[PDB]
């Protein structure tokens, strides 16, 4: 059995991509098995669909995300092996889960000034452009009414200077791609020292 | 964890949860360390992130993550090389290679029980190519004091045994 | 062409 050719992807969505082959060979009840994988998370297998038409639409699929594609042609006994394959990548998707592990540390011999640390964002969904920090003094204050600090998507670090002694404040970061802004971290509590 | 900087120094630092290990004008790897058990003060690292900035005419920004049990041979884009042969990733296996030709750079990952190792190697030029503001990595002047393990009398009665 | 001492760095569990 000769192995589908001329095998496509169309990029329609952060979750959608239609394959698309040719037939070379040919009504008969034949069916085509189209395969599919990443290699986000480590060690994963390939997820499989059967279509009857020279077309699949792949759904459910990851935003940001570089995809492997081939099809192959089974009828009854006589089954080909899989056609060489074609690659797709889903489009950017805003991001859906805010930056992690965010710690925030006293500088050395700077009491007055902190330093953050934190992750991406396990769902980037996208190449971050940058990621929003938000302090204050006050947990319940209005977010429009905390002290916004824009920085670079690249670092995953920032210094903040002139902070009060001996006061407690609350941090939380945002991450930003070509899509927009995704949700913020929960506050941190972080006590500058006192004297 | 232990920490083994770029100006040979050996230290045992707390630092717990998200720290720089570098911070340059080429590179972000970023780590995030847990206590080995909750009274202890004995962290390790069970996140690493590599930033391999964007650099012109060689490769597209490249993100690496790996996580206790989830060591990937591939970017967060499941993307293999740069936007050509410039940065490329290695599986050899729980064994991950980071080949950055463009940067001389090196990175290599292993996951060592429950737990994940890192080494670094990058040319002298580069590795201390970054501003005044960067001033916390690790790979280069180790951790803050504050975040040193200090035995001082035991370290010393097993010196001087 | 983009092909760039070295410095080594290593971070190991406690
Ligand atoms: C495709 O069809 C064959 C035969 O009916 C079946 O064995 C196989 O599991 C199907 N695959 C999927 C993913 O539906």
Known sequence: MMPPVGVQASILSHDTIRITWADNSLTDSRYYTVRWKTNIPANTKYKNANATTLSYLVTGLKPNTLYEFSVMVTKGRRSSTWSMTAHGATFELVPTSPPKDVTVVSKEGKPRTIIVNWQPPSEANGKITGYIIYYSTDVNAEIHDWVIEPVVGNRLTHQIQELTLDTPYYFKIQARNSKGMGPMSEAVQFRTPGT | ?161 | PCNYSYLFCGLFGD
């Open chain 2, 1 to 161: 964890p232990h920490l083994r900087t770029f100006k040979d120094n050996f230290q045992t630092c707390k630092v717990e949860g998200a720290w720089p290990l570098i911070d340059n004008n080429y590179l972000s790897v970023q780590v995030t360390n847990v206590p080995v058990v909750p009274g202890s003060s004995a962290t390790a690292t069970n996140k690493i992130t590599i930033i391999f900035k964007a650099h012109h005419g060689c490769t597209d920004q490249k993100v690496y993550q790996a996580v206790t049990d989830d060591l990937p041979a591939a970017f967060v884009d499941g993307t293999t090389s740069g936007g050509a042969k410039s940065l490329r990733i290695v599986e050899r296996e729980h064994y991950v290679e980071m080949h950055a030709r463009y940067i001389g750079t090196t990175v290599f990952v292993r996951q060592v029980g429950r737990y994940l190792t890192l080494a670094i190697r990058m040319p002298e030029d580069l590795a201390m190519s970054y501003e005044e503001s960067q001033d916390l990595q690790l790979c280069v002047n180790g951790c803050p004091l504050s975040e040193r393990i200090d035995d001082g009398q035991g370290q010393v009665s097993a010196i001087l045994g």
